[PDB]
Amino acid sequence: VMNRLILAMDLMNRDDALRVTGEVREYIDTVKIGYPLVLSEGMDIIAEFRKRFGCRIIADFKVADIPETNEKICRATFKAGADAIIVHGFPGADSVRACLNVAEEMGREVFLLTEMAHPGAEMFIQGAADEIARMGVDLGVKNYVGPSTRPERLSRLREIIGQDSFLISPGVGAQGGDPGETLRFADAIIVGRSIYLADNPAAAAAGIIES
Amino acid sequence: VMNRLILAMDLMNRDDALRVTGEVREYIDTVKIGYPLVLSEGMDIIAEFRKRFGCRIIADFKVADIPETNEKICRATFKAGADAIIVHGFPGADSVRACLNVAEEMGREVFLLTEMAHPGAEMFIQGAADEIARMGVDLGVKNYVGPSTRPERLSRLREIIGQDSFLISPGVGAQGGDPGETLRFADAIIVGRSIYLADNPAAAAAGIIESI
Ligand SMILES: O=c1cnn([C@@H]2O[C@H](COP(=O)(O)O)[C@@H](O)[C@H]2O)c(=O)[nH]1
Ligand SMILES: O=c1cnn([C@@H]2O[C@H](COP(=O)(O)O)[C@@H](O)[C@H]2O)c(=O)[nH]1
């Protein structure tokens, strides 16, 4: 990923989202689009971004349903042009396999979310995280998401998945995570608010890269 | 809910979804719309269904993000006209609280998903389910979702949330759950494929209602 930095574009109106993404395009070539923007502006926004900025798009949909529904969600998402989709591992192996099957059929990728970065993640997710990561390895998952806010957990996750797996990590900046420390374990960092709420998003992105 | 039956409308094209929903409207007045339909036809489909069929709409979005993002998802969903939203409890109390705060601000409801009905739910969700339900009670959640496929777990869930809470349950029909047994514990059952993939959805819905 360009500069090992992925922009989390969670603004909810198309004009602001287009403005910020265009301003930071010289620093990042991969954008993570989630439900805040998609449910506000429509799925067509994925193809619009891919074309206008020539960036890879990761759909952060935290897929977390039964197998049959997960398949439908993944198919609609890849039809919309997403290059990859983020899926929760807490619902179990069959739910993750359903996403992997659709990605295989459509020539796309699945990122498995193992542990989340917010405080509430300590209640139930953290205790299941190592097992969720091992499940991913057993299913053949090669792309993972882990927390910038807990580098000791990111280290443990990297250990389970190996150095060959691709690991991206949110929670940098606004949630307290540090870019440099996170990149000791993750291949790329995800940054949203620290860039998109900045008075000068380009300067904020440039600063992160400088750091 | 009318006849204690909620239709899970997971068809992915507007014309088919409109046809089936209209055919079974005399049997059910509450429709659950999820991402399969919304990501295929747009969020405007929620208001269209609400108006066209005069039914309550539950947005089954299995919200499962950090607090800040959950707030945005809930706000966009209620702006689109949904009467309620289904949220996962596994990400923790702060994430659930964020959804409850937006529902309070907008005069809407949050349904907390405690245990899922599919086989994979046994891996991680089941072992956390009782605690997730208790967390819901502690947060003031009054609406819950539990599995038709495991009535013993549904009974345990009803036990934690009390008789005053509203409990709806998917997994009836296609996934193996039984309407009658599920209604021993849930206030309403959710049915998707058994109705929408039937050669005659109205007859399928009518049969379910007669079996209970
Ligand atoms: O454990 C996780 C998984 N995903 N995200 C997501 O990554 C982005 C982080 O944004 P932020 O830089 O503004 O905090 C948001 O889209 C958020 O939903 C997290 O924050 N934590
Ligand atoms: O634990 C859960 C939670 N939600 N659903 C959802 O309820 C519906 C059940 O549909 P079905 O009757 O066709 O199996 C689908 O929309 C599905 O995503 C389940 O099946 N199980």
Is the shortest distance between the CB of A191 and ligand 1 below 6 Å? yes
Torsion of CA B198, B204, B205, B208, to 10 degrees: -130
- Which residue carries 């245990």 as its tokens? B115
Q: Closest Cα to atom 19, ligand 2: which residue?
A: B170
Residues 6 or more apart whose CB falls under 8 angstroms from that of B83 comprise B50, B56, B57, B58, B108, B109
Interface touch A91/B120, C-beta < 8 Å: yes
- Quick one: which of A175, A165, A119, A176 has its CA closest to A142? A165
Dist CA A170 CA A146 (whole Å): 7
Interface touch B34/A65, C-beta < 8 Å: yes
Catalytic residue IDs of A: 62
Q: B206: how many CB neighbours lie within 10 A of its CB?
A: 16
Structure tokens at A66: 């039964």
Residues 6 or more apart whose CB falls under 8 angstroms from that of A85 comprise A58, A59, A61, A63, A73, A74, A77, A78, A99, A103, A108, A109, A110, A111
DSSP state of A189: E
Mutation test of the interface with chain A: which of B118, B130, B131, B169, choosing the one with the most A Cβ atoms within 10 A?
Answer: B118
DSSP state of A168: E
What backbone phi and psi angles, to 5 degrees, belong to B171?
100, 10
Residues of B in contact with A69 (CB under 8 A): 10, 34-36
The single-letter code of the amino acid at A136 is: G
Contact B125, A131 (CB under 8 A): no
Contact A82, A103 (CB under 8 A): no
Q: Which ligand is nearest to the CA of A70?
A: 2
Residue B51 half-sphere exposure, CB side, CA atoms within 13 Å? 7
What structural domains and CATH numbers belong to chain B? 1-212 (3.20.20.70)
Structure tokens at A90: 């807490």
Dist CA A29 CA A17 (whole Å): 15
Is the shortest distance between the CB of B8 and ligand 2 below 6 Å? yes
Resolution (A): 1.6
Percentages helix, strand, coil for chain A, rounded to the nearest 5? 50, 20, 30
Q: A152: how many CB neighbours lie within 10 A of its CB?
A: 8
Q: B98: how many CB neighbours lie within 10 A of its CB?
A: 26
Is the shortest distance between the CB of B89 and ligand 2 below 6 Å? no
DSSP state of A113: E
Residues of B in contact with A89 (CB under 8 A): 124
Interface touch A39/B43, C-beta < 8 Å: yes
Q: Which ligand is nearest to the CA of B95?
A: 1
The single-letter code of the amino acid at A65 is: D
Q: For chain B, what's the residue count?
A: 212
Residues of A in contact with B65 (CB under 8 A): 34-35, 62
